[PDB]
């Protein structure tokens, strides 16, 4: 089943959200011929739509803010699919404001999930994986779907640079 069956509905959703949110977004899709099982195609749309929404709302900054920070004025959102062996890898990348890891740590300490003492030596992945804790901010819901497809998800993010969410699906 080509993934384009899912990806083809996204330019409309992205442009509707950009408009309602007053962002300017350059949306690029790559790898849309990538084939995978019908069950995956039927289920992956919801979690991707959530990731695209997060990027437009929380990641990409309004154009005035990007200019004020010396970034290219219009933010860019790239959705990509490819094969890596017998697995399909889907990426959602934006060049927005990124995730503030300090805020994550503060929030985790408030919620009683980590000691201040242990926050100093947390890895980058340890910190960002708090976002998957249920009720932390829902990245939990994204992970729940990916998990039910026997996939995995990771986040990479750096403040002011942007965010890349990666989803790895088995052949099934
Ligand atoms: N793409 C993207 N960029 C920023 C953020 C998110 N996703 C979700 C967490 C909140 C946040 O700040």
Swiss-Prot record:
Involved in the transmission of sensory signals from the chemoreceptors to the flagellar motors. CheA is autophosphorylated; it can transfer its phosphate group to either CheB or CheY. The chain holds residues 356 to 540 of 671 of the full protein. It comes from Thermotoga maritima (strain ATCC 43589 / DSM 3109 / JCM 10099 / NBRC 100826 / MSB8). Coiled coil: none annotated. The lineage of its organism: Bacteria, Thermotogati, Thermotogota, Thermotogae, Thermotogales. This is Chemotaxis protein CheA. It is found in: Cytoplasm. The gene is cheA. Disulfide bonds: none annotated. Residues 1-172 form the Histidine kinase domain.
């Amino acid at each position: 089943v080509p993934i384009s069956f899912v990806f083809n509905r996204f330019p409309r959703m992205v442009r509707d959200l950009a408009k309602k949110m007053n962002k300017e977004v350059n949306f690029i899709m790559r790898g849309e011929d990538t084939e995978l099982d019908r069950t995956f195609v039927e289920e992956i749309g919801e979690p991707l739509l959530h990731l695209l929404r997060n990027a437009i709302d929380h990641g990409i900054e309004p154009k005035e803010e990007r200019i004020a920070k010396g970034k290219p004025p219009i933010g860019t959102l790239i959705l990509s699919a490819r094969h890596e062996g017998n697995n399909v890898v889907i990426e959602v990348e934006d060049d927005g404001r990124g995730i503030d890891k300090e805020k994550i740590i503060r929030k985790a300490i408030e919620k009683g999930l980590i000691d201040e003492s242990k926050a100093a030596t947390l890895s980058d992945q340890e910190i960002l994986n708090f976002l998957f804790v249920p009720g932390f901010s829902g990245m939990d819901v994204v992970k729940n779907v990916v998990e039910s497809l026997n996939g995995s998800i990771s986040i990479e993010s750096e403040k002011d640079k942007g965010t890349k969410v990666t989803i790895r699906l088995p052949l099934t």
